[PDB]
Amino acid sequence: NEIKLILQQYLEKFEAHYERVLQDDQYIEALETLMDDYSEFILNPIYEQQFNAWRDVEEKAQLIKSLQYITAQCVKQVEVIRARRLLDGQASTTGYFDNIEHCIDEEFGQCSITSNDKLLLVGSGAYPMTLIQVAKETGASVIGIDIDPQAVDLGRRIVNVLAPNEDITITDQKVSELKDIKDVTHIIFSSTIPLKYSILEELYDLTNENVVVAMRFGDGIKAIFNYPSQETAEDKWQCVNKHMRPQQIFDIALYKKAA
Numbered sequence: 001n002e003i004k005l006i007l008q009q010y011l012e013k014f015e016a017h018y019e020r021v022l023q024d025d026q027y028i029e030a031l032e033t034l035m036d037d038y039s040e041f042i043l044n045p046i047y048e049q050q051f052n053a054w055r056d057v058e059e060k061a062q063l064i065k066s067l068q069y070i071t072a073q074c075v076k077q078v079e080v081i082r083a084r085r086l087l088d089g090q091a092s093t094t095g096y097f098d099n100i101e102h103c104i105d106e107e108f109g110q111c112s113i114t115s116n117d118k119l120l121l122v123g124s125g126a127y128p129m130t131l132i133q134v135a136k137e138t139g140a141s142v143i144g145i146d147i148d149p150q151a152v153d154l155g156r157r158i159v160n161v162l163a164p165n166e167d168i169t170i171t172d173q174k175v176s177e178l179k180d181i182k183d184v185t186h187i188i189f190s191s192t193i194p195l196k197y198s199i200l201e202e203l204y205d206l207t208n209e210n211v212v213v214a215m216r217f218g219d220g221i222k223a224i225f226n227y228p229s230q231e232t233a234e235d236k237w238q239c240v241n242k243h244m245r246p247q248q249i250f251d252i253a254l255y256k257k258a259a
């Protein structure tokens with residue numbers, strides 16, 4: 001009940017900060033600072049307990065749902081801002097970016113992806129760290145898909161700056177449109193994708209029998225800055241590991257073939 005205020009305050013701020021950042025590139029610092037606070041807020045044990053204590057299903061669910069959407073748009077823009085800034089000759093980071101760009105290597109596991117493997121990232125974004133960091137680290141081919149053309153465009157330009165000689169392709173194709181989906185060994189889903197589990201189910205018959213999927217997600221209080229986990233259809237995708245990260249904004253669920 002008491003916490004309710006904070007979330008509605010965040011929702012209003014994120015709504016205001018987003019509209020302001022679009023029309024004027026002066027309120028960037030404000031948005032980045034807001035996301036740095038939000039990132040810290042969801043990793044605070046105090047507010048986690050307060051959040052979990054709150055019950056009222058309908059109202060809470062709608063509030064979480066409303067927060068998921070606005071923060072989705074904010075992450076998109078914060079990536080665009082970082083992309084434009086790098087292209088303008090200035091590397092940068094934030095509390096938010098520093099949090100997530102840590103354990104991108106060991107999302108599947110330590111020394112899991114080899115040189116011969118091929119990773120597919122669903123929802124690459126304007127600043128595709130995952131593509132760049134995996135490509136340079138493992139020396140593997142990596143693909144990125146995004147429904148946003150701005151993300152595709154900037155993504156290609158950023159890849160060209162940071163990893164020009166690595167095998168990195170980004171398109172606006174869907175999993176069904178990908179020609180060499182059968183050769184894909186690893187698949188990462190971005191947390192903030194509302195159709196990620198819908199595309200998971202689809203990818204079963206498209207992918208080979210040795211494929212492994214890393215689904216980024218956030219349950220409980222993290223669900224305000226993430227789309228949560230879900231049950232998967234029986235005798236298809238099997239959750240072999242749920243990787244909770246108490247100091248990171250998103251957790252990881254590993255899916256493999258049932259046989």
Ligand SMILES: CSC[C@H]1O[C@@H](n2cnc3c(N)ncnc32)[C@H](O)[C@@H]1O
Nearest residue numbers: 075076123125146147148151193195
């Ligand atoms: C900013 S990182 C998140 C990215 O995922 C992308 N995204 C959201 N939903 C989907 C989807 N269903 N398929 C592919 N990419 C998506 C968004 O366009 C955004 O750039």
Ligand SMILES: N[C@@H](CCN[C@H](Cc1c[nH]cn1)C(=O)O)C(=O)O
Nearest residue numbers: 124125127128129130190191192225
């Ligand atoms: N561009 C990024 C992909 C987007 N990263 C976000 C991180 C996040 C989770 N919650 C809030 N922010 C996501 O995984 O949904 C990459 O290359 O990993």
